[PDB]
């Protein structure tokens, strides 16, 4: 099994962002406004094959987001996005997680909507980057998450084969569309992520309240 | 030439279900976060080669960010989500600015995300129905806006070119899948939604703070 792991939210916190929401807006709750419109613009530019970097994308939707709440923004507020969201600490939980998962054999990757950048990378500077065999990116594809050709691209990087990987990520949207390619998908529930369910749309395979509870059944699911 | 305009929101007051999220959230700003998810597992589905009606997209979404709440849904709580859904009034600028464009020599169609439904429809309930040639929806091409094909579909059963169209919406995602096809694009500026600028994505080929405003813009058009 190669573990595949989607980066932001799921691997570094999210919410350490909450700061500049607070600031901006008078409302760190701001940032479950935003972060979904990010998602959804990142996915209309790939359906209508337009591409910009993740980190772009971000900032025009905290520009967007910010006139849609008549907030004030300046090109600083800009550059702390930025500082913020290439710099998100790990949770606590995911060291100990990754440590057990690689004592158990599996492989471990990490594929993310994020571009590459001249060093440190956001997995360098939380202290993870190091358990992992290789760092995917969809700058590459110069397509988003969910599309398919990022997970059978993903695939063919690693010589496997759809049913060897797992996606695991805390979005929803994100492993429906691995499991689309024939990988499983593992979800792990991050604050203010829980699963959609909807006739048709095959729940995840494994699901954790925390990285160590996905762990427990990934391991389990080996006997 | 042919004026394409979204309904929800665009045409059709999405504010009008804030009386449902502030009985169930405490807070009808919980509006903006449930609307971009909707949208976003909308372009999930569609990328994955899913399909589920956007009325149930939308129930699943509002259980789900109720769940990322912690706040309590029972079924009824659904079911006034799908009345008032499917009875979003006309903003009071809509009618008369639909006479302008119908006076002016324009035809004018719609094209919703929302699936078909038992009479009377949305726009009907909203009494502007009888101002357009054609209702169109994304649930007989089975993929959500932006996809390409909901936007050549259109044109087709128009019998139309890609430069006779403009796609009305006030979601900058919705015309830049229609730009993206060679349309036209008009954007109304509806509470909450302001342009997203991002470089190399073309902006809204006209721009109306109301129905009214963009309504002079197209008409100016004309000479």
């Given at each position: 099994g190669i573990l595949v792991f989607d980066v932001?939210?799921?691997?570094?916190?999210?919410?350490?962002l909450s700061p500049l929401f607070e600031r901006v807006?008078?409302?760190?709750?701001v940032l479950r406004e935003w972060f979904p419109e990010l998602i959804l613009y990142s996915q209309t530019l790939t359906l209508t094959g337009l591409y910009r970097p993740f980190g772009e994308i971000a900032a025009a939707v905290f520009e967007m987001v910010a006139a849609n709440h008549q907030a004030k923004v300046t090109p600083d507020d800009i550059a702390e996005l930025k500082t913020r969201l290439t710099s998100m600490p790990a949770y606590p939980d995911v060291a100990p997680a990754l440590t057990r998962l690689q004592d158990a054999g599996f492989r471990l990757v990490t594929l993310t909507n994020s571009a590459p950048s001249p060093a440190p990378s956001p997995l360098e500077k939380a202290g993870?980057?190091?358990?992992?065999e290789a760092h995917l990116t969809v700058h590459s594809s110069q397509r988003f998450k969910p599309h398919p050709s990022v997970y059978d691209s993903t695939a063919e990087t690693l010589g496997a084969?759809?049913?060897?990987l797992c996606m695991i990520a805390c979005h929803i949207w994100a492993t429906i569309g691995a499991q689309a390619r024939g990988w499983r998908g593992g979800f792990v529930a991050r604050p203010h992520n829980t699963p959609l369910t909807l006739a048709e749309v095959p729940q995840p395979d494994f699901i954790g309240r925390d990285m160590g509870e996905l762990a427990d059944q990934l391991i389990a699911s080996l006997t």
């Open positions: 932001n939210e799921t691997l570094l916190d999210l919410t350490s807006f008078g409302d760190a709750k993870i980057a190091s358990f992992f084969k759809p049913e060897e």
